[PDB]
Amino acid sequence: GRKPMFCEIIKLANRKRLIFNTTDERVYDARLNYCSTADSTVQADCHIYWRLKLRRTDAVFEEYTGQGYSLDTAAYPQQYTDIIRGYYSKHVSSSLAANTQHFVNVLAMLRHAGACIAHYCMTGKIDFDILSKKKHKNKEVVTLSNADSLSFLPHSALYLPSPLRASDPEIFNMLYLLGCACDASIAMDNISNTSGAAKYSMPHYNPLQLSHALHVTIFYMLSLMDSCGYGDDAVLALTSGLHSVTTVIAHSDEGGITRDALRELSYTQPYGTMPVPIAGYFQHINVLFTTQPAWDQFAGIWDYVILATAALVHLSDPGMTVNDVTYPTTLTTKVATVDGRNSDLAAQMMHSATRFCDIFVENLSTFWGVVANPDGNASQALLHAFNIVACAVEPNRHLEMNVMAPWYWVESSALFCDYAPFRSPISSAGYGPQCVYGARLVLAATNSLEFTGEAGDYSAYRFEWTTMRHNPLFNILNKRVGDGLANVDFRLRPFNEWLLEGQPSRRSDTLDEYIWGSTSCDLFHPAELTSYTAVCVRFRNYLSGADGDVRILNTPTREVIEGNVVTRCDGIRCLDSNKRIQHVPEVARRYCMMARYLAQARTFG
Amino acid sequence: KPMFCEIIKLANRKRLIFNTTDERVYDARLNYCSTADSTVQADCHIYWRLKLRRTDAVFEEYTGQGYSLDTAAYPQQYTDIIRGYYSKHVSSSLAANTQHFVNVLAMLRHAGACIAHYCMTGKIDFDILSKKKHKNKEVVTLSNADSLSFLPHSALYLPSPLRASDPEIFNMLYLLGCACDASIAMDNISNTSGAAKYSMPHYNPLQLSHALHVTIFYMLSLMDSCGYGDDAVLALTSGLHSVTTVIAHSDEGGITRDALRELSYTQPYGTMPVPIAGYFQHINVLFTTQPAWDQFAGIWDYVILATAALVHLSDPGMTVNDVTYPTTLTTKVATVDGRNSDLAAQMMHSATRFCDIFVENLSTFWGVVANPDGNASQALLHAFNIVACAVEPNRHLEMNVMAPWYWVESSALFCDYAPFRSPISSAGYGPQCVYGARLVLAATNSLEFTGEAGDYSAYRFEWTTMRHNPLFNILNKRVGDGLANVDFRLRPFNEWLLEGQPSRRDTLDEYIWGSTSCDLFHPAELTSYTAVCVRFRNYLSGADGDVRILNTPTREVIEGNVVTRCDGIRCLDSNKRIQHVPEVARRYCMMARYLAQARTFGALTIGDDIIRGF
Structure with missing residues (x-):
């Protein structure tokens, strides 16, 4: 991957209040100017609002079950497998097979890390307690030397080599925190800076560079998984966490089915070996912020990415061709909905969500700069999340319908400096975005x-x-x-x-x-x-x-x-919610x- | 650029305005004498009331939702020099062979605002120049930022060579970009009691105001090099009139004052190259460092009044029976809560032409060259649209008949009116007396x-x-x-x-x-x-x-x-x-x-049949 889409569009809007509960919400306002080329008299200003809410006061501290999706087939490519040699003792590293496998599964860590990011963007508080789900206190870590004893563990373990701690201490510390959050056996070369202690102590940070390290680790892990080819899946997990801690309340009663899909998308315990990152994997994000940025600019960039993820779903969905003229997907059912559940509508939504998830994770990976996985592995994961949403026996607000228009999450009509990267049929049909940010369309x-x-x-x-x-x-x-x-x-x-x-x-x-x-x-x-x-x-x-x-x-x-x-x-300003x-x-x-x-x-x- | 002359420059004011209940008046006495008989003459005093819009008019929230200019590409020399400023840092060497866009309209409008505030109240500090938000503005630094970072097309990047050539324009740009809060980025901040806190030396109000003047003209030159001059010019005048209420002579006119005030701009960006010799800098109005407040207030009050008076000379001709009358609006629908939606509609249908004429006269008033696309006209027409559809009890529209294109009398205010393209002056309704000449x-x-x-x-x-x-x-x-x-x-x-x-x-x-x-x-x-x-x-x-x-x-x-x-032109206090x-x-x-x-x-329905009974 090279360049991910990160226009500081939402960064420019300066946020004032921090959200501590679910009663209030941050509203991003965007004005659009419409005028005819016939005569400039007939004009208007449309106020697109995007309302962001904290899901729950402690929406990050959710019970981790360690069950669900389990990617057990992401092995490093050649360069990373060679760099892995060099974490064993020289004697072992010299005579090791050239075609060894090192399977990586950081997905649960990225989901919880995205959750922490958006929780920080809403509330503005982040610390080791949050990042570890109250577990960094007494996490005992196996202290194998020279990753030769890595096969000595009775199971797969998340191994953090010493070259990583020497290169980027913050990345190493954040990975320790995250792997501590979701149940994960950690393996480090020197257990404690003071020889004799069974617990790795933290160089306590300030929240500013703490969140900076969280950011840099998100990008590190994204690059790591992308080196395997399962990048789209990693970023899917990331956005899952993001929208798992915040609720971007939709522009329709129906919309937000995809929200419930991303909620129910969980991942199993992480593992693998974390090499020292390749120097120029992600060339640059389109925005540039300094080491230890204020909560302001951080909340800016990551609210933009929350809303851009939310916008992609509308931006990409298969337009249904009726009498070969394409319409936005709309699903109809004759059967009457019962006790908040429409079964036939659920099945219809699944049948269409197949193509929807294909094109949606294609466009999401486009938005992150990671090439989409040639096979639709991640899309199938999201489709199964839809399936668990559909056949849930509980009542559901979004499926009280009898005629619903599934794929419209938030307006995607003002948050992208360019839409040419995305492949979307709805844009070709004209129901897409109407005004590129910073261009008169x-x-x-x-x-x-x-x-x-x-x-x-x-x-x-x-x-x-x-x-x-x-x-x-x-x-x-x-x-x-x-x-x-x-x-x-x-x-x-x-x-x-x-x-x-x-x-x-x-x-x-x-x-x-x-x-x-x-x-x-x-x-x-x-x-x-x-x-x-x-x-x-x-x-x-x-x-x-x-x-x-x-x-x-x-x-x-x-x-x-x-x-x-x-x-x-x-x-694009921001402000407070009114009646x-x-x-x-x-x-x-x-x-x-x-x-x-x-x-x-x-x-x- | 010298298209404004030194008329109110020479009048001497001394009163400082502290509240809105007070105002200064620029009295211009005129001698009307018939060429036939030199004893039928009269002395008529035009007045020009200037008061403070509010006590704290400069401190109005920026919000940031406004007209968003784009495609303001630098000319060649600026692309070369900006490529030079970029290649110094690896985090900027990425954007090397990309075309760079500037958009300082927001800072320009706030500069106009605070400069009018200075001409009236006399006091300026860093609070008044930065919406009193300078205190905790965190600047991202291009050296301290990670290697994964990259200089966006929308960051106000103040190169270090700019502070090397002239630190006054540097500190002023920083203060204004802090006011119109924008991602300001320097090559490096000197970590000193703050990781991003930018400390600057306290200036005496006079040097501060001189720096403000020279940086206003720096930004005007910068935007003008892109052809988008009236794009960064009109904004300046909008800022000017955002602080000084220029009491209109007629209740009908002066709607353009609210039109200008309703105008805002999106957050600034682009880089700030060192000025290339003089494209617009060659014309330097004042030269003494820390010039006295009187002469400065003179120059900028005359600019205020010349802009405000350019409307009367920038008025479209309403044709009635092949005769040209000053464009006057008329409606039948009754006023409801102090508004006539149809009067507003006709005001828009007249502004459709009034705005391009007005911006033509403004361009020729500041000498900034015009451009074909006429974006400025678009922005002003949008501002009129906003002041029209606003659901508030709005005076200037309590009326069923109204004359919109006349805000302040434009006679005796210009060394001459030759360059202004105004069709209401080819008809009889232009100036009554040119300044410094017998007409x-x-x-x-x-x-x-x-x-x-x-x-x-x-x-x-x-x-x-x-x-x-x-x-x-x-x-x-x-x-x-x-x-x-x-x-x-x-x-x-x-x-x-x-x-x-x-x-x-x-x-x-x-x-x-x-x-x-x-x-x-x-x-x-x-x-x-x-x-x-x-x-x-x-x-x-x-x-x-x-x-x-x-x-x-x-x-x-x-x-x-x-x-x-x-x-x-005397300067007098508030009479009754x-x-x-x-x-x-x-x-x-x-x-x-x-x-x-x-x-x-x-139109064939009002010909010679209006006159009844010969």
Whole structure:
């Protein structure tokens, strides 16, 4: 691997408060400027919020079962296997087989380390107690000399050679801490700096360089596993820990299934031999922070990576092709959900999550700079995590559905300096991100349409219609409360049927009636208010009252509906959660006419 | 760059403003004298009120959400020198053959803010220059950072050669980037009672302000080398007006003040190369180190006022019947909680052109070369959009008819107006008197004599706008009767737009508004698309024991040109007569109906049929 994607986009926003509980949450605000290339009058500013919460007050101190995924086949490549020779005594190192195996499994350590990182990013506290899960106190370590006695242990053990402690003492100390956190036999060359003591004592650190060492060890272990080819799997474990200690509360009632997937993704006891790292494995992160950085910049970089991981899931998922036109994946079930569990929806979600996990870990490894494993080993792990989520007999909030749009975690529309690295079909379909951070993106104003004519006080267009997100002009109007998105209406519709309608209360006729609450993200859900058949929309361009005057209105003109939109990004601040952010959209998720249209849709496979 | 001249430079101020209840006024007295008769003259005092926006206006949260410029690539020489500064460190040698982008707009705007704060309150320190956040700004150091680290495209990198060539610009850049909090990175900090704490020598306010000036111009040069000059220029003026409220002359205008204040920028970045000789540095306004606060306040107060007045000369021409009137807005929908959404919509549809004209005049005012893409216009139009759609009770929009493109009277404020591209000055509504010159202009509109009854002479004016003919302010500022002898012959058809005093409803001084600031008639105050008959009362009542004559001008003066001239600019304190606001009629009038009917249906709907009964 070379360069991982780390734009200091979230680093620039300065955080003020530290989170000590689950009642409050840190909200990253990003403004987006939308304007037509037709005329710069029709503009709007959309506030994407990303809300981060501490999962639980002690979400790192969770019982470690040591069960689940167990990678027992990650052996070092040639260079690392040769460097491993040199940890044995010279006599042994000289006459050792050239094709020896050294199997590495640091995954549990990386998951707990990611958990510690994000716990530090929320609360700002990190120490040996946290990093060791209250175990570094009385961890007895076998003290074999010259790693010749390594085969003398009745089992595989996590071995920390002396060259590593001499090269980068902080990496060695952090690996000791982590291997102490998750049950793991450690092997060191000199047990205690003071000969005679059975416990390795710590050069106590300051939290600043402590977290710096945590960072550098995350990258060390990532490079280590990547040298084997199981890099994608290592980074999957890392993000598992990250989202295992923090909850990035989603932009949809459904979204967060992947959160529950990453929660249930655990790893078994670690082991292996940790060589002195190859000098130029990870060339550089795109950001640069100093030894002993303040909690500020550290929280910055790692909140950015939390949110970028969260964004990748939406960024990459297989678009379902209905009548060979691609839509965001949406899964429908006729059977009624029972006691918070929809079984058929679970099975549908699994069947699609196959391809989802393939493409998602491909893009995640792209985002970390680690080449994706040629075989989909890690993707299968994530799919099994999905499986344990699906058939869980407990109730689940995210599967109370009857029509859900699975893969939309957080908006990915402003956190990437570039999207060209990722391979995603949803971007090619247009439901992807809309504004590259630091670039004015000229996208199509709406769907391909045709002007069907105008009446007296209205003007109609036949949208070949896919989804609201594919019609990016309507959030310009959505923001404008002064006669903006109340002049668009559907009283020209033959049958008024939408999957994922929005505001289902006032059913049981303007476009503002068929939209989501959308208070936390003014940009549109990728499967927002979709229909597979072309629909016709009329705008109320004027208003001729009953008296006789003809008031002209601010409805965009024809060349606005037919000319492109330009979108740029604005500042990204952070702030505190208010009542208005928490407002949760009530959305229509029940088997409708469009539902049973999709159940019989083409869906070419 | 020398496009600003030394007018308010020479006026001498001494008062320091401590609160917002106080202000300084830049009084400019003008002599209005008709070329025909040298005894019909008057002394009219324009005023220019400047007060503090708040007590702590400079300390406003940066937030960081604003217009985000990009693709501000350095020219060739700067790419070479920045490659040089990069290759020194292995952690920067990575980004060697990559094109480097700069964006100091945020620091530039905060610099403008604190420089205005200095011109008003006189005090500056590191708190005022760094939002009092300098105390604990941690600088990442390029030497102490790990080898896995790498200098991002978005870090404010202050090279060491910059501090080697000039430490004042260095410390100022550091302080401003601390204010507009950004990832500032030096080649190495001298660990001294702090791992990243950057300690700097305490400056006397004068050297501090001089460093601030020279670094403002450093950054202007830097952004101008990229073609994005008005991109880093407008921001400076926005900062200027973010601290000094430049009381407008008219309640309609001065919306652009809030437009400028609503404007913000994204966190700065790019590297800071040492200035290459002089591209913009060759023009150096002041040269003495630690120059006195008076002359500094002079230069920057004149810059404040010239910017604020450039709007009046940067106004799009509203065409009515192939005649150009000053762009005035009009709506029918009633005001709700002090706002007219339709007035805001029309303000945007006018700003669409007003903003590119304004930025053209600003570019030619600072001499920074223009660029085709016109990003600055985009940013300002976005700021207008923000000030329009804001859901707050907003004065400057309590009205159904409003004149937006006139904030502060731009007459007698420039050594000349030759370079400014303003179409409202090709029409009659530009400056009234150039500074340092005697300007001859037409004293009434196309005029025709139409009868002389007893002690009255009537004239048909082919009226266009009150300002367009200035003889009336000579008659108003006459030591004798102020227009009490001139009146109208109103008919059904001559309708008044923005008429003077609605509370009264025939002498003309009622139909003016009595602007106690800027005696000069506000463009588009007494507009009318028809002709108007006007009587001058020469004599008192006949058939009495007396028939007295008055100083009312004769037909030569009324038809002959007037010349105008400026007589210095005093600086005065806060009087009381100047605060008096005019009570102008701002309600949906029948004249507004013509504009609405012309917009909705067509311009051919208001031709020669506005005049009823010949």
